[PDB]
Structure formats: structure tokens, C-alpha cells
Amino acid sequence: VKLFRASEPILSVLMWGVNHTINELSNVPVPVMLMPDDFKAYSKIKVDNHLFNKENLPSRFKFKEYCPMVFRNLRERFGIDDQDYQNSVTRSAPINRFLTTYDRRFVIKTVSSEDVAEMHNILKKYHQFIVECHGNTLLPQFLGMYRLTVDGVETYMVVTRNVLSHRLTVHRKYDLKGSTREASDKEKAKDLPTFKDNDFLNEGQKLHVGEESKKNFLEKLKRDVEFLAQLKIMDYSLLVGIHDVDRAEQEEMEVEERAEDGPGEFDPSVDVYAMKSHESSPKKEVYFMAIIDILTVNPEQYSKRFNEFMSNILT
Amino acid sequence: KVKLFRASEPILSVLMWGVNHTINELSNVPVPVMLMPDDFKAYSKIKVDNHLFNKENLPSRFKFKEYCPMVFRNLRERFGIDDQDYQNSVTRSAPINRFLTTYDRRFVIKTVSSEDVAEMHNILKKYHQFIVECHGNTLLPQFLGMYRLTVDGVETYMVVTRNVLSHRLTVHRKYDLKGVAREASDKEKAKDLPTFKDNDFLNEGQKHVGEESKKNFLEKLKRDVEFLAQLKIMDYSLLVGIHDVDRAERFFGPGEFDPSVDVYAMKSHESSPKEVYFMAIIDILTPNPEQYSKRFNEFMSNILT
Numbered sequence: 001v002k003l004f005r006a007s008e009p010i011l012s013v014l015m016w017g018v019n020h021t022i023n024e025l026s027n028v029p030v031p032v033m034l035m036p037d038d039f040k041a042y043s044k045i046k047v048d049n050h051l052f053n054k055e056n057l058p059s060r061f062k063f064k065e066y067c068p069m070v071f072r073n074l075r076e077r078f079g080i081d082d083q084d085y086q087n088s089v090t091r092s093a094p095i096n097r098f099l100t101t102y103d104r105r106f107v108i109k110t111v112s113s114e115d116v117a118e119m120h121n122i123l124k125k126y127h128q129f130i131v132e133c134h135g136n137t138l139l140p141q142f143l144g145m146y147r148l149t150v151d152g153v154e155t156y157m158v159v160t161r162n163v164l165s166h167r168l169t170v171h172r173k174y175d176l177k178g179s180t181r182e183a184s185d186k187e188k189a190k191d192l193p194t195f196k197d198n199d200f201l202n203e204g205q206k207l208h209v210g211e212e213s214k215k216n217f218l219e220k221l222k223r224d225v226e227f228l229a230q231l232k233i234m235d236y237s238l239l240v241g242i243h244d245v246d247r248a249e250q251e252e253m254e255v256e257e258r259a260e261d262g263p264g265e266f267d268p269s270v271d272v273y274a275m276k277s278h279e280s281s282p283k284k285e286v287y288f289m290a291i292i293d294i295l296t297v298n299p300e301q302y303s304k305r306f307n308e309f310m311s312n313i314l315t
Numbered sequence: 316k317v318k319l320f321r322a323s324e325p326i327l328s329v330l331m332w333g334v335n336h337t338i339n340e341l342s343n344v345p346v347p348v349m350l351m352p353d354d355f356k357a358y359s360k361i362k363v364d365n366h367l368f369n370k371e372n373l374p375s376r377f378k379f380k381e382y383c384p385m386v387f388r389n390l391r392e393r394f395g396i397d398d399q400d401y402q403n404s405v406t407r408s409a410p411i412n413r414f415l416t417t418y419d420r421r422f423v424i425k426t427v428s429s430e431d432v433a434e435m436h437n438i439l440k441k442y443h444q445f446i447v448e449c450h451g452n453t454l455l456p457q458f459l460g461m462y463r464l465t466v467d468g469v470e471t472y473m474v475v476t477r478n479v480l481s482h483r484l485t486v487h488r489k490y491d492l493k494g495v496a497r498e499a500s501d502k503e504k505a506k507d508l509p510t511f512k513d514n515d516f517l518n519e520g521q522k523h524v525g526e527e528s529k530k531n532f533l534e535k536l537k538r539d540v541e542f543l544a545q546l547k548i549m550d551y552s553l554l555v556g557i558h559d560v561d562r563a564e565r566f567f568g569p570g571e572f573d574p575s576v577d578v579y580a581m582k583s584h585e586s587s588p589k590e591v592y593f594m595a596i597i598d599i600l601t602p603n604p605e606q607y608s609k610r611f612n613e614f615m616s617n618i619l620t
């Protein structure tokens with residue numbers, strides 16, 4: 001019995017819309033293959049509830065889903081069941097627009113009309129490219145694109161798999177691109193600041209993943225970034241998050257002590273970007289690495305610049 | 316499990332979609348402690364525009380309006396109808412033959428007019444109150460939902476009632492009884508199941524129900540009609556159905572029925588020459604009326620032994 005409670009009406013409408021579209025989708029047979037129209041497709045629903053059901057939702061709102069057949073399939077290819085996805089978004093409000101779902105599995109970006117245009121151009125190729133790699137990629141996994149209308153205003157959203165873990169704590173993160181950058185004193189003030197290229201090198205940080213992994217990683221990064229230049233795309237980043245296993249085990253202990261008054265483990269079928277640090281690492285760690293920001297010097301250039309840098313991070 | 320909304324016309328497919336959509340939406344709405352005045356002036360409107368999506372049974376573009384959903388959900392409850400069953404009955408399979416029934420013959424779907432919907436709003440508060448007071452025990456039509464479909468820019472209003480007739484027992488003759496010169500017409504007398512009238516009944520000599528039933532059913536009919544008269548309504552009929560058992564001759568034997576589903580059904584008295592009767596009031600959305608009640612109420616008391 002879902003109320004769609006949230007801090008803002010926009011979030012209620014998002015919960016409502018993901019709920020409503022996923023249910024509708026489930027009365028729609030699963031196609032043998034996709035069709036070219038499915039990439040021009042969209043659903044539009046428009047609600048006027050007069051003196052009815054207004055405890056949580058506005059009386060009046062609009063929900064558009066772009067290419068709902070393509071993104072259903074995109075979800076299947078990434079191993080996300082539609083009911084799981086729906087539940088992550090509807091059981092309890094997303095919290096942060098840069099939203100996460102209450103359970104941290106899914107990330108919800110507010111985007112621009114441009115971004116949405118860009119999604120459409122690249123969509124045909126992105127699908128095929130997710131197909132021939134079987135979902136094995138460091139690229140953003142796109143699960144849904146939506147336009148919400150509340151109080152006459154329009155908001156564009158894209159849903160992605162969280163790069164970071166849904167359970168394990170991130171103690172330090174970077175945004176990397178590979179260009180001739182630094183996190184501002186304003187950032188450095190945040191609890192968990194987003195650091196950048198020069199911060200990464202300036203502190204000598206390296207990630208000890210182990211060779212069988214460093215290779216499976218750099219081969220992904222290679223297809224991925226060649227695909228991105230081939231599509232003429234630029235300015236993307238490697239998000240790099242670091243979880244210190246031993247420091248978390250202690251944070252836990254201090255969390256249990258307070259209330260009263262396993263470690264380094266993750267499901268690679270959920271924490272899809274996560275690598276254990278090599279037996280020989282100086283610290284017991286977990287990393288999360290994946291490419292972000294591909295909607296929005298040159299492309300052929302960035303590709304190789306970007307690629308050399310990320311290769312040097314690992315060992 | 317997968318509900319396609321395959322139906323004869325696309326308007327029926329919208330109906331299925333709409334009942335499905337509103338009933339689900341409602342399952343997320345708490346059941347309130349009481350209805351409020353606004354519940355009688357409320358509605359849901361939803362407008363669907365699907366481009367190159369989900370167009371196998373549904374139009375790409377259509378509109379669905381549901382009137383006073385909190386009232387009708389309460390009415391359903393008071394009539395002992397579960398929302399999920401109601402939903403399944405409309406939704407599992409297209410309705411059949413405007414005047415439809417759901418594929419399981421449990422619910423009728425009458426197409427009605429703008430002014431009918433207006434008359435409904437006009438009588439809803441009092442009709443609700445009366446259904447409350449008689450504890451759902453009434454011969455009146457049981458209003459389950461009222462809807463407005465918009466398909467092709469054309470608007471169609473619908474009311475769902477409970478079926479008077481059984482949803483399983485074949486009906487072998489039926490009458491429509493009011494109380495002037497009215498009887499089955501020439502071409503009407505010709506169809507598979509004719510709808511005879513007061514004079515075809517009287518001149519058919521047709522009359523056999525337990526004394527208890529005649530007593531309790533007449534206490535029912537009277538209480539209802541004094542209410543239909545108080546509301547300055549008239550022109551309503553009494554739909555009667557006759558089901559002969561022998562003529563029908565694992566399985567549900569002859570003359571067997573679930574009184575909780577077939578709510579108007581009544582078996583013959585021992586003394587009878589062996590039938591099942593179906594009786595309830597119909598057609599009450601149309602505004603002498605006080606005399607229409609007694610004229611109607613007595614022509615009826617003389618068809619029961």
C-alpha cells in the first residue's frame with residue numbers, strides 16, 4: 001500500500017511515474033527483438049485528480065517516459081529485474097537534483113533538454129554496444145529517462161546504476177578525466193569531498209587490484225572509450241571511490257556502541273563496479289570505478305588521454 | 316497474468332484499462348473513517364498519449380474519467396463486493412453483449428447519457444445514505460462505478476451495476492413490469508429471449524414464492540419505492556427472470572446457486588407447479604410519482620403467492 005510520501009511533490013510524482021510505467025510495461029509482452037520505432041517511442045500520462053487522492057501527490061501533474069521498450073530491455077541486459085527497480089524507487093522516497101533511491105542501488109540525475117536529445121541520438125548505438133559486450137562495460141548503465149511536469153514546470157531525469165556500493169561506505173572519492181585540474185577549498189570542506197586529477201597524483205594514490213583484474217578493467221575501459229570517441233563524445237570522467245575495510249569495521253563498532261546505550265565483502269551482482277584490493281595491498285580496501293558523464297582538445301584525443309591516465313592508476 | 320486489453324471495440328479496451336488503472340490507484344488510497352461532502356464532488360481524470368507504444372489493443376490516445384471514486388469504492392464495500400474481484404471481472408476478459416456484462420456475467424455495463432450522470436450526482440448522497448441505513452439490503456440497482464471514456468474525441472458515459480439475473484443459471488423467460496397499454500411488441504416477441512410486460516404477464520396468468528420471501532421481499536420493495544418516490548423519481552421497472560430447472564436437463568446440479576453471488580435469486584416453494592426466480596428494481600436515473608409508487612407496489616404484490 002504505497003503512499004508516495006516525499007519531501008517534494010516532484011519526488012512523489014517520480015515515485016508515482018516509475019510505479020505506473022513499470023506496471024503498465026508488465027502488461028506489454030516482451031519482444032523477440034526491439035524495433036526502430038521503439039527508439040522514437042514514448043508514453044505520456046496526464047493526471048487531474050479533483051478533490052481526490054491529494055494527501056501526497058499534486059492534483060495535477062504529467063509523466064513522460066522516453067523509449068520505454070528500449071529501457072526495459074536495457075534493464076534486462078544489465079540484470080535488473082523490473083520489480084526490483086520499481087521497488088527501489090517506490091517503497092520509500094529517493095533521498096539526496098542528485099538523488100539516490102532509499103536503498104542506494106539507483107542514481108537519479110536531473111538533466112537538461114539537451115542531455116535528453118543527446119540520449120536519443122546515441123541511443124541506437126548504445127543499445128547495440130551493450131548487446132555485443134553482454135552488459136560488460138564501465139559506461140553508465142541507463143535504466144530510464146523521464147520528463148516530469150509539476151506546477152507547469154518540466155523536469156528531465158535519467159536513472160542509472162549507482163557506481164558506488166549500495167552498502168559499503170565510501171571514505172574517499174575522485175573525479176578523473178586526464179587533462180592539464182583540482183578540487184576547490186569549498187569542496188575540500190565537505191565531509192566526503194570530490195577530489196580531482198592533481199589531487200590524485202599529488203598524494204601518490206594507487207589502487208592495488210591484482211593483475212587478473214587490472215586487465216579485465218583496462219580492456220573494458222578500452223572498448224568503452226573507443227566507443228565514446230567513435231560517438232564524438234567528450235568531457236566524461238572516471239568516478240573513483242575508495243572504501244577502507246578496516247576503518248569501516250571500526251565505524252560499525254562505534255555505531256553499535258552508540259545504539260546499545262562481513263568486512264570487505266560485496267555482491268558483485270549488485271556492487272557491479274567493485275574490486276577487492278590485491279592480497280599484497282598496504283591497506284585492505286574496496287574500489288568502485290566506472291565511467292560517468294557521457295551526455296553533457298577533442299574526441300579522438302580525449303579517448304587516448306583519458307585512457308592512459310586510468311591505466312596508470314592501477315597496480 | 317498479463318492483462319492485454321483485447322476487446323471487440325477499442326472503447327471496451329479503454330474501459331478495461333480504466334477500471335484496472337483506477338482500482339489499482341485506489342488500493343494505495345486509505346479507506347477513510349467516513350465519506351466527506353467533497354467525495355461527492357470529486358473525480359479522477361487521466362489522459363493517455365502513447366506514441367509508438369503499447370498500441371496493440373489500446374488507442375494511443377484516450378481519456379478516462381471516474382466519478383466520486385471514494386463513494387463508489389464504499390458502495391462496492393457496502394454491497395459485499397471486493398475491489399479485486401470487481402477489477403478481475405472487468406479486466407480478465409473483455410465484456411460481452413449498449414448493454415454489456417463482464418465476461419463472467421456478474422456485472423452489467425450500461426451506456427448512459429450526460430443527464431443520467433447528472434441525475435446520479437443529483438441522488439448520490441441520499442442514495443448512499445439509504446444504502447447505509449438499509450444495511451445494503453435493498454432491491455434497488457447497485458451502483459458499483461460510473462465512468463466517462465473519451466475515445467476519438469467522443470465521450471461515452473458508463474454505469475456498472477450488479478447483474479439482476481444469475482451469472483450462471485440460464486434465464487428461460489423474463490418480464491419488465493411497471494404498471495397503460497404496454498406489452499411485448501410484434502418484432503420483440505420474435506427474439507430468442509423476449510421481454511414481456513405487465514399485460515403479457517397478467518394475460519399469461521403467470522404467478523410461487525415461500526410466504527417468508529413474499530413477506531420480506533415486499534417489505535423490501537415498499538421501503539425502496541417510498542425512497543424512489545421521496546426522490547421524485549419514476550418510470551422504473553421491475554426486472555423479473557424465470558429459470559426452469561428441468562428444461563436445463565464435477566458439476567453444479569439443477570437449480571443450484573450461490574446466494575451470495577446471485578443476490579436476487581429465489582427458489583420456488585414446494586407447492587409450485589420448479590423454478591428459480593430473479594427479481595430487483597432497475598432504471599432509476601430519470602426525474603404522479605407518489606402514485607406511481609403505489610401503482611407499482613401493488614401490481615407487484617399480486618404476482619406472489
Ligand SMILES: Nc1ncnc2c1ncn2[C@@H]1O[C@H](COP(=O)(O)O)[C@@H](O)[C@H]1O
Binds near residue numbers: 041064113121
Ligand atoms: N524521439 C526523439 N528523437 C530525438 N530527440 C528528441 C526525441 N524526443 C525528444 N527529443 C529531444 O529531447 C528534448 C526534450 O524533448 P521533449 O520531450 O519534447 O521535452 C528536446 O531537445 C527534443 O528535441
Ligand SMILES: Nc1ncnc2c1ncn2[C@@H]1O[C@H](COP(=O)(O)O)[C@@H](O)[C@H]1O
Binds near residue numbers: 164175239
Ligand atoms: N552513477 C553514479 N553513481 C554514484 N554517484 C554518481 C554517479 N554519477 C554521478 N555521481 C556523483 O555525482 C557527482 C558528479 O555528477 P554530477 O554533478 O551530477 O554531474 C560525483 O561527485 C559523484 O559522486
Ligand SMILES: Nc1ncnc2c1ncn2[C@@H]1O[C@H](COP(=O)(O)O)[C@@H](O)[C@H]1O
Binds near residue numbers: 254
Ligand atoms: N580497534 C581500533 N582500531 C582503530 N581505531 C580505534 C580502535 N579502537 C578505538 N579506536 C579509536 O580510538 C579512539 C577512541 O575510541 P573509543 O574506544 O570508541 O573511545 C577513536 O578515535 C577511535 O576511532
Ligand SMILES: Nc1ncnc2c1ncn2[C@@H]1O[C@H](COP(=O)(O)O)[C@@H](O)[C@H]1O
Binds near residue numbers: 423479480510554597
Ligand atoms: N441491473 C441489471 N441486471 C441485469 N440485466 C439488466 C439490468 N438492467 C437492465 N437489464 C436488462 O438489460 C436491458 C436494459 O436495456 P435498456 O432497456 O435499453 O436500458 C434489458 O433487456 C433489461 O432486461
